[PDB]
């Protein structure tokens, strides 16, 4: 369980709320054990006293303990629940922040390796780690402390009897949970195998339903899928076949303690040949003490899941980020001139204020040029300079301000239209915010619940043409001297494509625009067109220069 150490240390932020919740859980159990033990002794003590001992019994002192044990149990249970639930929501909040703060400095590179379903495990693993306190730590620590307090306090009467009740209770806290976790390991492995095989077969049956029904194979794959459910439901049964045994044995152990207390305390308690009332003290302590052990066997099974979720999160967060940003201080320049040298070793100079287009064919060559221009990973090839200075010398706070990126995949957050644009500029007037929506031709989004309509999962899914316009709105809001266009006007119709290109030229006129495109629309406006294949610039120049020299750009315009 050494995998839990990075997350146990997260408990230091709330170690008084977390430890109070455990204390209130122990105090409630000792009031349950105390009240029934004191009730059992009071009956036997007053029975043997009889009427003749009415005046000399002193029943006021037990009554003050019965009153206190009922209040302690009543209030302890109410605050056990409140404190331990408050603390569970505080642990989850600090786990979500810790996971996010460790996954962001390695955002593009570390998680690159299906990133869609990786995050559903991350979200589910943080939830499972949140269970370590109430589902695992609180029952196991509470049971151990309750057993010792009973064992210690009950030994002021008879050491032999206290140790044979605590010894039985300590044996089944330390020996019984591990013996059942080990017993069901073989079935718990066969249960995870068949669950992910059913998910694999189900998903392939729903995703390929058009192919399966057309080719007449939908019924015989539903059969194979419903046979994996039968195997899965049998592995689930054998897992309950063992949980039904861990609950019957816990009943027999707690029955053994009562039999032993009835038998062993019959001979004598301490030096007393006939214990009298002390027989019921030990029997009624053995009856109530095994309610503290009820959660522990199931609290150890879930410990295997919490450990498994702990290594998965630690495998991600304990990675080395590919880029390290120096902690220096820089003033963002109003004009950025970008120059590159030997990055399969391409060199280009982009003067401040001029636009540039890159004509790489997709697939034959992927432009990771914009990815290392935003420091997603360091360029092993050579040097990248920003405004006659190395890009690596800029701290992250100023690197972001000096480059605005419109990524090919526009992310629409589950948030209002205002929250999707205050992303770009942290503080923008509610009217200055609304002006950009009109400029980029997104006044339709202003028609109904403008700047308050929920976007994303909650509703209002944006179309491709309207979602490209939103990325440009973010770039225009986030005023940066250098703009990196990552394949804009791709997948859009001719009307929208021409609308965005004219929007790009009119709105971004005093900005250094570096565009990566595989189209040819509107490249006359761009000066110094760059054409490259597999990271090798064939030639370059303005629109007229390429046509005159009859290079590769000339045959592109000829349809060849």
């Amino acid at each position: 369980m050494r995998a839990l150490l990075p997350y146990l240390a997260l408990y230091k932020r709330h170690k008084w709320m977390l430890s109070l919740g455990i204390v209130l859980a122990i105090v409630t159990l000792l009031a349950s054990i105390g009240l029934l033990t004191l009730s059992g002794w009071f009956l036997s003590a007053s029975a043997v006293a009889g009427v003749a001992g009415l005046y000399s019994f002193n029943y006021m002192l037990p009554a003050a303990g019965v009153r206190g044990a009922a209040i302690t149990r009543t209030a302890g249970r109410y605050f056990e629940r409140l404190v331990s639930h408050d603390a569970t929501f505080r642990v989850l909040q600090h786990l979500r922040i810790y996971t996010f703060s460790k996954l962001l400095p390695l955002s593009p590179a570390g998680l690159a390796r299906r990133q869609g379903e990786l995050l559903n495990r991350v979200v589910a693993d943080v939830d499972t780690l949140d269970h370590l306190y109430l589902r695992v730590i609180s029952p196991l620590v509470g049971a151990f402390v309750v057993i010792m307090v009973v064992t210690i306090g009950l030994s002021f009467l008879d050491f032999t009897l206290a140790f044979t009740l605590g010894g039985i209770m300590l044996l089944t806290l330390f020996l019984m949970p591990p013996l059942f976790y080990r017993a069901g390991k073989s079935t718990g492995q066969n249960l995870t195998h068949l669950r992910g095989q059913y998910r694999q077969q189900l998903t392939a049956w729903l995703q390929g339903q058009a192919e399966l029904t057309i080719f007449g194979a939908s019924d015989r794959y539903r059969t194979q899928l419903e046979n994996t459910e039968i195997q899965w439901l049998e592995a689930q049964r054998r897992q309950s076949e063992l949980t039904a045994l861990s609950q019957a044995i816990m009943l027999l152990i707690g029955a053994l303690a009562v039999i032993l207390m009835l038998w062993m305390a019959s001979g004598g308690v301490g030096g007393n040949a006939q214990p009298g009332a002390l027989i019921a003290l030990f029997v009624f302590c053995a009856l109530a003490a095994f309610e503290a052990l009820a959660p522990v066997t199931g609290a150890f099974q879930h410990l295997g899941q919490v450990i498994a979720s702990a290594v998965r999160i630690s495998d991600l967060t304990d990675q080395k980020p590919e880029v390290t940003f120096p902690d220096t201080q820089t003033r963002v320049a109003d004009r950025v001139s970008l120059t590159l040298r030997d990055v399969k070793g391409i060199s280009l100079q982009v003067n401040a204020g001029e636009h540039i287009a890159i004509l790489g064919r997709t697939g034959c060559g992927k432009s990771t040029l914009l990815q290392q221009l935003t420091r997603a990973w360091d360029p092993q090839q050579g040097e990248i300079l920003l405004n006659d200075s190395p890009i690596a010398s800029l701290n992250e706070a100023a690197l972001r301000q000096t480059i605005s990126v419109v990524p090919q995949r526009v992310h629409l957050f589950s948030a209002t239209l205002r929250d999707n644009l205050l992303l770009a500029s942290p503080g923008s007037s509610d009217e200055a915010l609304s002006e950009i929506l009109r400029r980029v031709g997104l006044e339709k989004l202003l028609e109904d619940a403008g700047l308050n309509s929920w976007l994303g999962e909650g509703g209002r899914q944006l179309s491709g043409g309207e979602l490209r316009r939103l990325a440009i709105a973010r770039a225009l809001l986030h005023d940066a001297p250098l703009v990196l266009l990552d394949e804009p006007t791709e997948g859009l119709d001719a009307t929208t494509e021409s609308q965005i290109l004219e929007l790009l030229a009119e709105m971004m006129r005093e900005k250094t625009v570096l565009m990566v495109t595989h189209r040819l629309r509107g490249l006359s406006r761009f000066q110094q067109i760059i054409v490259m294949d597999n990271g090798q610039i064939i030639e370059q120049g303005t629109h007229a220069e390429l046509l005159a020299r009859q290079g590769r750009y000339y045959q592109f315009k000829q349809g060849l």
């Binding site: 009240l35 109410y78 639930h85 694999q200 339903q209 058009a210 949980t243």
Partner: protein
């Protein structure tokens, strides 16, 4: 009764429980046996304890009551073991039937509806959410039957020995439902909405994780940590306000089980001292009656205190029943299933007259369509994205219902039986899916009983055999989940090989060469151009320059066919096609 969503979902949960009433009745019968064995266990312990404490009898003389006490403990552990294996069966046979109902409905709806949600969204509904209901049926429902059998059976046992001790337990019996009616039921539905906010807060964290690439390039790392902090703290504060009311039920039940144990001890304690002379039946009060009442006083409230331990079993089944109840009740418009059958296997002729294509929810996908495709003539669909091109191919496959007239060889498509109509059909489709196990089974999906020669002929004709040596095991390579071993260019050729294996009357090709390599485009269209001349073909594409030889072109915009004709006349006409061709030729 009650109009809250908590009670409406809980009513649905119980209606699904009649699938395994047989097991929920055995578990109820075994709860009466648990109540009887609890009372017998307490009566032996009280009878033993009286002999030792009052009569001073050595333990060796009480070998018969000790023996009977051990059997009662052994039988109790047997019933507990039996009652939980029976309990599992009740949950399992309900989830099997609900999972079968979800798969039946999601198969009847067809691919037109399954593609409305991601594949992982359906697996959550089928695996996680159906399984979230197991503990409600295996644990919570049996325990809520135990909470009325054992407490009532405890009282009937202590009544003959001492009626005053029976009133102490019985007096607290109606107060617990009384608290529920007043303030407990109100907080139960408020809790149901906090579990929705906790699931909604989990999607706010997943959203910030899915968009870390966007937050990184905008320098919003520190401002989303604060956004996470504020959302988390907002949830906790609102949830803790409700949980102050919801945790009173756990506190009140602990107050009544503490007051009743205290009252039993106090009343019996003073009855022995002579201060109180009521409650017994004039036969005198004994120590055995006191221990029986005191041993059974915790067990009177134990079924109710254990029902609060199973709270999340009900809370997560209601959250699952929230999603399964709407799924099973969303109105779906299934395309009409006919009884007709196509006469021959020759290429079919398609005629559409005022045809409208309707999605399962009811939305119109393709507007008025009027076209005719004589037998054996290849046709091309072109247009912008979202112009309804796939809807026409979905309708011809039988996946979407249509309001107009769409006749196959003079027979309406509604009247054609889908089982036999789809044997005369072969669709390559957009975003192809290889749902078999290995690459030999994906090709042989069209007919598994095919000779090895035809398998090789189909693999050669589709240019799949040329990259087979690159695969480790060859034709027996396992493609795996979503064909991770095959690239999108070479997984697209296996789809072609599957389509061409069987003869067909109509071949539908939807964006076959879209999003492939420059080499896989050549190989796919080389096979599909030659395979389109053997029967009636309807292809959807944006490779407008290659399609100079197809018989007819349908330029489709806004769900309607706005231009028809051959490529020779449409290219130079200057209409909708020329704009599309001009736009396409910009791509390099």
């Amino acid at each position: 009764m009650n109009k809250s969503r908590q009670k409406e979902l809980t009513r649905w949960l119980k209606q699904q429980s009649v699938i395994s009433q047989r097991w929920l009745n055995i578990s109820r019968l075994l709860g009466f046996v648990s109540g009887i064995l609890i009372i017998a266990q307490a009566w032996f312990m009280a009878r033993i304890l009286q002999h030792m404490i009052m009569e001073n009898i050595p333990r060796e003389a009480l070998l018969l009551p000790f023996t009977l006490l051990v059997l009662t403990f052994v039988l109790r552990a047997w019933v507990v073991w039996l009652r939980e294996r029976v309990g599992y069966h009740a949950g399992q046979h309900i989830r099997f039937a609900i999972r079968r109902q979800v798969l039946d409905r999601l198969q009847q709806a067809g691919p037109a509806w399954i593609q409305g949600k991601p594949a992982g969204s359906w697996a959550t509904l089928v695996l996680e959410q159906i399984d979230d209901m197991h503990d409600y049926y295996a644990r919570y429902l049996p325990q809520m039957a135990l909470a009325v059998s054992v407490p009532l059976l405890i009282v009937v046992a202590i009544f003959p020995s001492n009626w005053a001790a029976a009133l102490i337990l019985l007096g607290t019996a109606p107060l617990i439902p009384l608290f529920m009616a007043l303030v407990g039921m109100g907080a139960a539905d408020a809790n149901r909405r906090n579990f929705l906010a906790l699931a909604r807060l989990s999607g706010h964290f997943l959203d910030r994780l899915r968009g870390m690439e966007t937050l990184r390039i905008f320098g919003r790392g520190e401002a989303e940590i604060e956004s996470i902090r504020s959302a988390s703290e907002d949830f906790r504060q609102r949830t803790m306000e409700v949980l102050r009311l919801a945790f009173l039920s756990s506190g009140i039940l602990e107050f009544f089980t503490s007051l009743s144990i205290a009252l039993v001890a106090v009343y019996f304690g003073f009855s022995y001292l002579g201060e109180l002379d009521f409650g017994h039946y004039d036969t005198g009060v004994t120590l055995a009656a006191g221990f029986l009442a005191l041993i059974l006083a915790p067990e009177f409230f134990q079924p109710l205190r254990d029902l609060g331990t199973f709270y999340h079993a009900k809370a997560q089944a209601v959250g699952a029943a929230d999603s399964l109840k709407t799924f099973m009740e969303t109105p779906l418009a299934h395309p009409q299933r006919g009884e007709a059958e196509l006469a021959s296997t020759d290429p079919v002729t398609i005629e559409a007259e005022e045809l409208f294509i309707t999605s399962p929810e009811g939305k119109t996908l393709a507007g008025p369509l009027n076209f005719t495709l004589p037998a054996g003539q290849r046709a091309v669909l072109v247009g912008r994205s979202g112009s309804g091109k796939s809807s026409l191919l979905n309708a011809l496959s039988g996946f979407l219902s249509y309001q107009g007239s769409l006749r196959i060889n003079g027979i309406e498509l509604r009247d054609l039986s889908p089982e036999s109509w789809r044997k005369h059909l072969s669709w390559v489709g957009q975003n192809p899916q290889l749902p078999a196990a290995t690459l030999r089974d994906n090709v042989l999906l069209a007919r598994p009983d095919a000779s090895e020669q035809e398998l090789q002929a189909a693999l050669d004709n589709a240019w799949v055999s040329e990259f087979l040596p690159l695969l480790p095991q060859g034709v027996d390579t396992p493609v795996g989940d979503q064909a991770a071993r095959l690239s999108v260019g070479q997984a697209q050729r296996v789809a072609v090989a599957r389509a061409l294996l069987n003869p067909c009357s109509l071949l539908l090709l939807d964006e076959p060469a879209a999003s492939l390599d420059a080499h896989s485009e050549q190989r796919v269209m080389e096979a599909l151009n030659a395979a389109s001349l053997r029967q009636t073909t309807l292809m959807v594409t944006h490779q407008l320059e290659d399609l100079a030889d197809w018989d007819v072109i349908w330029v489709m915009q806004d769900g309607r066919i706005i231009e028809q004709g051959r490529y020779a006349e449409l290219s130079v006409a200057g209409g909708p096609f020329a704009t599309l061709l001009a736009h396409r030729q910009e791509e390099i």
